[PDB]
Design a protein around this ligand. Structure first.
Ligand SMILES: Cc1cc2nc3c(=O)[nH]c(=O)nc-3n(C[C@H](O)[C@H](O)[C@H](O)COP(=O)(O)OP(=O)(O)OC[C@H]3O[C@@H](n4cnc5c(N)ncnc54)[C@H](O)[C@@H]3O)c2cc1C
Ligand SMILES: Cc1cc2nc3c(=O)[nH]c(=O)nc-3n(C[C@H](O)[C@H](O)[C@H](O)COP(=O)(O)OP(=O)(O)OC[C@H]3O[C@@H](n4cnc5c(N)ncnc54)[C@H](O)[C@@H]3O)c2cc1C
Ligand SMILES: O=C(NCCc1ccc(F)cc1)c1ccco1
Ligand SMILES: O=C(NCCc1ccc(F)cc1)c1ccco1
Ligand SMILES: [Br-]
Ligand SMILES: [Mg+2]
Ligand SMILES: [Mg+2]
Lengths: 486, 483
C-alpha cells in the first residue's frame, strides 16, 4: 500500500516513468488506470491514449487508407485489375486494428505481472492528501474506495480528452474516440477542426467511404494546420482537395439536428447546412484534471486548465509531478515518454535531466504526410535578425507515372542566416515522417545548412533533396520577408 | 576548337563537373557522349548510366514491383478486389520508364542548347595527346574523326560497364543494360550475383513474371550482399525467399547452351542445371578505359583497368583528371557528382577539395529496402578495441495486419564504445533509404549514440527505433564478439 511512486494514468508518460523507476532504480511503483484494454466506455486504458485511441490505431488506419492511392497508382506501373470489383471493407480494418491494440494491452499486462514492485491498480485515481492516492470505482469522488496508496512521490499522467463544443446537438456528434469503433464507414462525414486529428481522419474516411461518399473537413479560420509551415499548410490543403476531400475554411458548426433517417443536419455560423452520417469533432484536446480532485491538495493549473509545472515536471506541491498531455504543452507520446524518463532519472536516479521541448520531430499522417522539426520561418524571423529559407518543391518522378501529379514533395530548411545554424526542417510527401527523425538528431548536434549540403546524397530518394540546397530561396531580415539581403 | 575543359562522358560526374566549370567558373566547356538518348546500342547516353540504365529506371521499376506486395497486403486492411483479374503489364512499365528516361535525355539536350560555354559533341572520346581529345564515329580508333578538341584540361568520366564472365555461352546471357529493354517479362530468370543489381532486378522480375513464373538468384559465396550488415544480409535472404525468389548460394554458372525452344540451359559449377528464359549477369562493373586510348598520353591505370587518381582526382598527367566509376572507388552517382564538383573547385576555384568516401549513405532497393551509412561491425571491430552494437529487430505492426509477417525491420547502430561515436547505421525495412539520408549528416557531425537516444522520437515510425536504443545488444572487444 506504501509506494515510492504512485502514477495516475498507465499511458505513454506514466508507464515510461513507472517501468524506469521499478527496473532502473529498484523502486516500488503503483500505476492506476480505469481500464485494462481499449474501447468503450473509457476508450483509453493500460498503454494510454496513443496505444488505445491515438497514434497506433490511427497509423494502422491511415496505412489502410493509403491502399486507395496504391491501387489507383499501380495502373501507371502496368498493374491491371477490375477497378469495378474494388471495395474498402471498413469492418475488416476495425477488427484488425482492435486485435493489434488488444495484443498491446495484453503486452503491458505481462509487463506489470513479470516486473517486481510494479503493480497495476484498476480504477480512478484522485488526490486525498499530498502523499495519498485514493483509487475509486468511478470518476465520482462519492464512489467506493478500491484502494488507499501512500506515496513518497505522486505522478499525474492522466493525459487529455477531446473538447466537444457546447452547441445544440453535440450529443449527435462524435470524437476521435468513437471514430475508432464506428460499425460502418460513413458515406458523408464532417471532420471539425484544422489540426492533425481532423486531417488524419478525413484521409481515413475518404479511403473507406461507400460509393457516392463525400468527406468534408471544416476549420473555423482560413488555413488548416496552424503551427505547421505555411507552404506545407497550403500544399496539404490542395493535395487533400485533389483526393476528393472538400475543405470548408472560415466555417464552424452552429448546431446539429438528427433528421428522421438517423442522419445529421449540420447548421454552420455562415448559415450553410450539410447532411452527413457522421460529425467528428476534433477541435482540441484538454487536460484530464477534473477527476483528480486537485483542489484537495492545492495543485495549480494554468489559465488553459493544464497542470502548471517547472522544467523538472514539478507542481507547486513537493513530491507531486506532472508529465504528458495533462501539462497542456506539446501533446505528443515521445514528449510524454521523455518527460517520464527525465523525472525518474532526476528524482530516483539523482541525475537531474530536463526534457528539451525545442527541435522535436513530429509528423501528420495526412496523405501524403508531413514531417517537421524545429521553428517555422515566421517564428524564427521574430527571434533572429537574419533568417534564410531554403526550399525545393518537385513532382516525384514516380507520381508523374502514378497519375498523382498533385503529390508535390516540399522540403524547407529555415536557418539562422548569421551562422547557417538549422532552425527548422519541414517536409511534405511520402516518407516525410521517416526522413525527419534523423533530422531531429542533426538539430540537437547544431547542424548548419553546410553540414546538410556537404553530406553526400542517397540517390534516388526524396531525402537527398535536404543535402542539395545551398542557396536561400528568400530571407526574413528583422522580421521582413525579401528575395535578397541588403 | 579550343576548350578550358573537355569532359569524356556526359554522366553523373561529367555533367556536374562541366556544368560547374561553365556556369560557376565561367570556363568554356566541351562534353562528349556516344548517344543523346537511352537504350540500344550503347545503353548509357547523355545523362550517364544512372539516368539511362541505372538508379532512375531501376527505382521506377522497383516502385512498380512494390505493387505486387501492396495489392496482396491491402487485403489485411480490408481491401477486396478480383485477385484473378490481376496482371503485371511489364510492357506498360517499360514504356512508362522509357518516357521518363527520354524526358531526362531531352532536358539535358535543352541544358546544352541553353547553357552558353557548354558544348555537347556526339561520338567516342579518346586521348590523341595531353591537350587534344578526338571524337570518332565508333569505339574503334580507326573510325572516322568527327571532332578534334584542344583542351587546357581533360576530365575522364566514362563510368563503368557490366563484367561478363568468359564462360561457354556468355553470348546467350545479358547484363542490367539489356534487362531494362526486355520486350516481355521472363517467366524464368536467373540473376547471377549477390550485389545490389542482382538483388534489385530479382525483385523487379519477381513482381512482373507471368503466371507459374520463377526468379532464381545465384551467388558464388555463402550469403548475398557482401559489404552490407550481416544481420541485414541474412534477413534480406529470408525476405526474398518468402516472396518466392530461389536464392542459390555457393553456386556459379559454368556454362550456358540454348535448349531447342531457345530457352537457356544453365550448367552450374556444382553440376546442377536450370532452364530459364533469361540469364542476367550482375557479377561486377569495371571502369570504361579501353576506348580512351590512354596509352597515347601515358595516364596510369591499375591492373583492374581503373584510372589511378590521388585524393583530388588527379591522374599522373597534369591537366588530366578522372572522377566517377572510372576511378573504381565508390560506384554511386552522388559520389561521382561530389568528385566532379570537388575537382572543378580544385582546378578552376583554387579552393582545393577532396571527396570523403567514408560515411556515405547508400541504399539497396530490395523489397523491403536497405539504408546504410558507415562501417559494419566486423570492419569496425578490426579497427577499434571496443565496439558496441545496438540492435532492434521486429515484425512492424502493419505487417501483422498485412500478412507479410516475414518483413522484419532491422535497425543497428555500430559505435566506438570507448567514446560512443557512431561508426555505422544499418537499416532494413520500408523507408530505410529515406531514414538513412539525415543519418549521413549525423555521422559527418560525429554523432554519438547519446545524440541518438537523447533525440525525441517521431511516433509512430520505423526511424524512432534509432532514438530508442540506450543499451548495447552485444560488443566486440579486441576483434572478439561478447555477448
Ligand atoms: C487521435 C489521436 C492521434 C494521435 N496521434 C499521435 C501520433 O501520431 N504521435 C504522437 O506522438 N502523439 C499522438 N497523439 C497524442 C498521444 O496519444 C498523447 O500525446 C499521449 O498519449 C499522451 O501521453 P500521456 O502520458 O500524457 O497520457 P495518455 O497516453 O493519454 O495516458 C493517460 C491515461 O490516464 C488514464 N486516466 C485518466 N484519468 C485517470 C484517473 N483518474 N485514474 C486513472 N487513470 C486515469 C487513461 O485511462 C489513460 O490511459 C494522438 C492523440 C490522439 C487523440
Ligand atoms: C543497374 C544500375 C543501378 C544503379 N543504381 C544506383 C543507385 O540506385 N544509386 C546510385 O547512387 N548509383 C547507382 N548506380 C551507379 C551509378 O549509375 C554510377 O555510379 C554513376 O552513373 C557513375 O557516374 P559517372 O560520372 O562515373 O559515369 P556514368 O554516369 O556511367 O557516365 C559515363 C558516360 O560516359 C559515356 N561514355 C563511355 N565511354 C565514352 C567514350 N569513349 N566517349 C564518350 N562518352 C563515353 C557513357 O555513354 C555514359 O553516358 C547504378 C548502376 C547500375 C548499372
Ligand atoms: O522523384 C523524385 N524524387 C524522389 C526520389 C526519386 C525517385 C525516382 C527517380 F527516378 C528519381 C528520384 C524527383 C523528381 C524530381 C527530383 O526528384
Ligand atoms: O510497427 C512498428 N513500428 C513502426 C511504426 C509503427 C507503425 C504502426 C503502428 F501501429 C505502430 C508503430 C513496431 C512494431 C513493434 C514495435 O514497433
Ligand atoms: Br559470404
Ligand atoms: Mg509486478
Ligand atoms: Mg551550349
Amino acid at each position: 500500500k506504501a509506494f515510492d511512486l504512485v502514477v495516475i494514468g498507465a499511458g505513454s508518460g506514466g508507464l515510461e516513468a513507472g517501468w524506469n523507476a521499478a527496473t532502473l532504480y529498484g523502486k516500488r511503483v503503483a500505476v492506476v488506470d480505469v481500464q485494462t484494454s481499449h474501447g468503450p466506455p473509457f476508450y483509453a486504458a493500460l498503454g494510454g491514449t496513443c496505444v488505445n485511441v491515438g497514434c497506433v490505431p490511427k497509423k494502422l488506419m491511415v496505412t489502410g487508407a493509403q491502399y486507395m492511392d496504391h491501387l489507383r497508382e499501380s495502373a501507371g506501373f502496368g498493374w491491371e485489375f477490375d477497378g469495378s470489383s474494388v471495395k474498402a471493407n471498413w469492418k475488416k480494418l476495425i477488427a484488425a486494428k482492435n486485435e493489434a491494440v488488444l495484443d498491446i494491452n495484453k503486452s503491458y499486462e505481462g509487463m506489470f505481472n513479470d516486473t517486481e514492485g510494479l503493480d497495476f491498480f484498476l480504477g480512478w485515481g484522485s488526490l486525498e492528501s499530498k502523499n495519498v492516492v485514493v483509487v475509486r470505482e468511478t470518476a465520482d469522488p462519492k464512489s467506493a474506495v478500491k484502494e488507499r496508496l501512500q506515496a513518497d512521490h505522486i505522478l499525474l499522467a492522466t493525459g487529455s480528452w477531446p473538447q466537444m463544443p457546447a452547441i445544440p446537438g453535440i450529443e449527435h456528434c462524435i470524437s476521435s474516440n468513437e471514430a475508432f469503433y464506428l460499425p460502418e464507414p460513413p458515406r458523408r462525414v464532417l471532420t471539425v477542426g484544422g489540426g492533425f486529428i481532423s486531417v488524419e481522419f478525413a484521409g481515413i474516411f475518404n479511403a473507406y467511404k461507400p460509393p457516392g461518399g463525400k468527406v468534408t473537413l471544416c476549420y473555423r479560420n482560413n488555413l488548416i494546420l496552424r503551427g505547421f509551415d505555411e507552404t506545407i499548410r497550403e500544399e496539404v490543403t490542395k493535395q487533400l482537395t485533389a483526393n476528393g476531400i472538400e475543405i470548408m475554411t472560415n466555417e464552424n458548426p452552429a448546431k446539429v439536428s438528427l433528421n428522421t433517417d438517423g442522419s445529421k443536419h449540420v447548421t454552420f455560423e455562415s448559415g450553410k447546412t450539410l447532411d452527413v452520417d457522421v460529425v467528428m469533432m476534433a477541435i482540441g484536446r484538454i487536460p484530464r484534471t477534473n477527476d483528480l480532485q486537485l483542489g484537495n491538495v492545492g495543485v495549480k493549473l494554468t489559465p488553459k486548465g493544464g497542470v502548471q509545472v517547472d522544467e523538472f515536471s514539478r507542481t507547486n506541491v513537493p513530491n507531486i509531478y506532472a508529465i504528458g498531455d495533462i501539462t497542456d504543452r506539446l501533446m505528443l507520446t515521445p514528449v510524454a515518454i521523455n518527460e517520464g524518463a527525465a523525472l525518474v532519472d532526476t528524482v530516483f536516479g539523482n541525475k537531474p535531466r530536463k526534457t528539451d521541448h525545442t527541435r522535436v520531430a513530429s509528423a501528420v499522417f495526412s496523405i501524403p504526410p508531413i514531417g517537421t522539426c524545429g521553428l517555422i520561418e515566421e517564428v524564427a524571423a521574430k527571434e533572429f535578425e537574419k533568417v534564410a529559407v531554403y526550399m525545393s518543391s518537385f513532382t516525384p518522378l514516380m507520381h508523374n507515372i502514378s497519375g498523382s501529379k498533385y503529390k508535390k514533395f516540399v522540403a524547407k530548411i529555415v536557418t539562422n542566416h548569421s551562422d547557417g545554424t538549422v532552425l527548422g526542417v519541414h517536409l511534405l510527401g511520402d516518407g516525410a515522417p521517416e526522413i525527419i527523425q534523423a533530422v531531429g538528431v542533426c538539430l540537437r548536434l547544431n547542424a548548419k545548412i553546410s553540414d546538410f549540403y556537404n553530406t553526400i546524397g542517397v540517390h534516388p530518394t526524396s531525402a537527398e533533396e535536404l543535402c542539395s540546397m545551398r542557396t536561400p530561396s528568400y530571407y526574413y531580415v528583422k522580421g521582413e520577408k525579401m528575395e535578397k539581403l541588403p
